[PDB]
């Protein structure tokens, strides 16, 4: 509950969209680890929502 309230996942997903159209800069060598982070944290139904 307080992970999303820190805004870090929201901060990340914005950076993913910013990088895909080609703040925290994102390189091509870091997209996969944070996508895996989103997948791993996505086990909880709160993240799925």
């Amino acid at each position: 509950k307080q992970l999303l309230d820190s805004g870090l996942p929201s901060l990340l997903v914005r950076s993913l969209a910013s990088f895909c159209f080609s703040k925290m800069p994102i390189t091509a060598d870091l997209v996969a680890p944070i996508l895996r982070f989103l997948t791993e944290v996505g086990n909880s139904h709160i993240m799925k929502d």
Partner: protein, 75 residues
């Protein structure tokens, strides 16, 4: 009887049938207001009709629900 009956917290007091598939179990649990997209199913094994429930909608049916497959044959 030396047999195992599976249970669930929401469907208390009703052992599940051995012929039920997991899709029907998801349908029953989602009928019982279980949160959608739950990570696991907490079944309990205790030593010793619901088969008609419709299986949950797989992603292909949802895609085919809005005629998505029609675009597939177009390409």
């Amino acid at each position: 009887v030396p047999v195992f009956h599976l249970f669930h917290k929401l469907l208390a007091g009703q052992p599940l049938p051995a012929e039920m598939t997991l899709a029907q179990l998801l349908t029953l649990l989602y009928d019982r207001k279980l949160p959608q997209g739950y990570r696991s199913i907490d079944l309990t094994v205790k030593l010793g009709s619901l088969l008609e429930t419709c299986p949950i909608q797989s992603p292909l049916q949802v895609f085919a629900g809005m005629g998505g497959l029609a675009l597939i044959a177009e390409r």
